[PDB]
Write a new protein. Structure first.
Length: 241
């Protein structure tokens, strides 16, 4: 009954209601690998069809990270300008981090559209360098054997960062940040997992992986606009034009 144990519980609950797939399912399907015939059917698809499918997954992924944020104790109580600043800087960073649950270190494959496949699945997109950076990142984290609670509390801190430029109420954002930071270290202490703090990616590795990812996604949307199931107008306004 400390406000801090309540926060851990309300963070982990929000994550559980928004994580799309259960970790038991992802681990049960690791033997369910795309065959050579199935990979080739993906390789043979138009760049722009692969772009449609991925644009769909990544949009859905963003919207689940938004709902995650809207269920974090204190988020809803911030002002709209600050909510949007945090989601604009952070929502896809969280998406990149969430992906590691779907990543199998042993064969270097990712759960995509029902089965596990290697980076060669996405050859028709032509962003071999970005896709290779996304696998490497996911590898780094998957080695750490990130647990559901560690992802939940870490991603919350990815979002609630009071150093994001353009916040109006810096002190209100600092109070949540401090509380979530305490939630995280408290948990890592109770689980003898403080050892991961030294192994996390630097803030810089994730910022730049994400800004290129968004850059590429923005170039695709310019060349080949997708139709988005827009749920959150203030944020969608900042990313589409
Ligand atoms: C920090 C953020 C990056 C980013 C966000 S937020 C959203 C998004 C999505 C939906 C809504 C909504 O209202 O439903 C709002 C925002 N898309 N997106 C992308 O990079 C993106 C994607 Cl995933 C697909 C295609 C093109 C692009 Cl540019």
């Amino acid at each position: 009954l400390t406000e801090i144990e309540h926060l851990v519980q309300s963070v982990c609950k929000s994550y559980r209601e928004t994580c799309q797939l259960r970790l038991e399912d992802l681990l049960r399907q690791r033997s369910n690998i795309f065959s050579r015939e199935e990979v080739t059917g993906y390789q043979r698809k138009s760049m722009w069809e692969m772009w449609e499918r991925c644009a769909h997954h990544l949009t859905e992924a963003i919207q689940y990270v938004v709902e995650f944020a809207k269920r974090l104790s204190g988020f809803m109580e911030l002002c709209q300008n600050d909510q949007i600043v945090l989601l604009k800087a952070g929502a896809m960073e969280v998406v990149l981090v969430r992906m590691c649950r779907a990543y199998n270190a042993d064969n270097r494959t990712v759960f995509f559209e029902g089965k596990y496949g290697g980076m060669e699945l996405f050859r028709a997109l032509g962003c071999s360098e970005l896709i290779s950076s996304i696998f490497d990142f996911s590898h780094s984290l998957s080695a750490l054997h990130f647990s559901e609670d560690e992802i939940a509390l870490y991603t919350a801190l990815v979002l609630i960062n009071a150093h994001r430029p353009g916040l109006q109420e810096k002190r209100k954002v600092e109070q949540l940040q401090y509380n979530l930071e305490l939630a995280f270290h408290h948990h890592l202490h109770k689980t003898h997992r403080q050892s991961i703090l030294a192994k996390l990616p630097p803030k810089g590795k994730l910022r730049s992986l994400c800004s290129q990812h968004v850059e590429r996604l923005q170039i695709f949307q310019h060349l080949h606009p997708i139709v988005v199931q827009a749920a959150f107008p203030p944020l969608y306004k900042e990313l589409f034009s």
